[PDB]
Symmetry: C2
């Protein structure tokens, strides 16, 4: 009956978690320990054959998967005032900007950087070849974000939206996990628009409090 | 006036090309001539990421990200919903459609094919990356094999933009990785996926559209 969000304290897991809480949506949260063998169990793979978090099981029992897609689903379903997103009829221009940035955040930020790094981290090391790939990918993503954020406060329209949630959660994760790594980049110096935007996004309502609930340590690097 | 699709001949680029051509949509296509054209100022104004493809709509607005362009062209030009499911009409299939477009872009392309293509140069790829790429493809194909079990198409009962997204990625995988250390033959372990790929390229004139390369002289095709 009631919707259930199965998730973990990760760059992808935290996105719909933040949105659901900002909306006070009737969504029960099942927070996995991290890492967990639960997502390899039969019952989970039935909900999400990709074997990744998060999964939202909706109020009819159907799984919705892919973090940035779940953002869209939760907004459409529970954000009745459109506080955190733009609908196609509401404002088509902004709707398409929102959609493209959710694809971009997923592919060019999360997938190209954090997911690749974590998949190739073992025993306190990421191989130099992968490490440089990831570093160059971060360089590209930050150049893009810096440009997009030029002359504005938020990614889309004139307010904090699901696009800001997607980007802020990835960036918060990067700072949480990679500050002590060979692939750290300090934004203060070369990407001032992104830094300014991050600080205002993390400061929005209770976003920071939500993210702190299951705070993680930096990855160890020899 | 007319919408314009700027592309190359790539895993992302052919997706909106295929849909547009299948719809006989009023979209002019310009293929750039390995190119640094996409670093030019006018192009960066349309797509600050400096990549292809970009669709500029009939009002001068750029739409980016291949799988998103699929959705936009479908909403805009697919009046009869031949190639997609709308949220209003079929919300259940709409969300399955949306999640698979995210999957194809992230797990198939970004996390796997893109990494493979970038790191396989001049017939060589570092062993550690090759191993990452192979394990990733094995997982993705297994997923697709599961999704396609007892089905002809990825979503609903017809060829859709999800099939377009997956087929273009698979076409590009074959075009670049066939004679390499990270080749995988689907016939061997993924027969559902092989059968689906053949069915998808055989759909209408898909195979023809995929053969299209830049015109020699003319700006548009
Ligand atoms: Cl996602
Ligand atoms: Cl895409
Ligand atoms: Cl990509």
């Amino acid at each position: 009956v009631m919707a259930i969000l199965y998730t973990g304290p990760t760059g992808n897991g935290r996105k719909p978690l933040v949105l659901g809480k900002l909306l006070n949506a009737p969504i029960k949260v099942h927070m996995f320990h991290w890492p967990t063998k639960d997502i390899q169990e039969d019952w989970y793979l039935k909900l999400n054959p990709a074997g990744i978090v998060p999964t939202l099981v909706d109020d009819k029992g159907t799984p919705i998967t892919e973090s940035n897609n779940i953002l869209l689903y939760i907004a459409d379903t529970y954000d009745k005032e459109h506080k955190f997103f733009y609908s196609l009829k509401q404002d088509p221009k902004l709707y398409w900007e929102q959609n493209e940035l959710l694809f971009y955040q997923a592919t060019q930020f999360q997938s190209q950087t954090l997911t690749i790094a974590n998949a190739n981290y073992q025993n306190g090391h990421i191989d130099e070849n992968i490490a440089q790939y990831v570093l160059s990918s971060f360089e590209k993503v930050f150049a893009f974000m810096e440009t997009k954020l030029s002359g504005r406060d938020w990614f889309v329209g004139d307010k904090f939206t699901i696009v800001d949630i997607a980007f802020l959660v990835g960036e918060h994760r990067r700072r949480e996990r990679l500050h002590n790594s060979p692939i750290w980049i300090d934004l203060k110096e070369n990407f001032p628009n992104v830094e300014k935007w991050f600080q205002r996004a993390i400061a929005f309502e209770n976003v920071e409090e939500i993210l702190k609930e299951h705070a993680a340590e930096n990855l160890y690097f020899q």
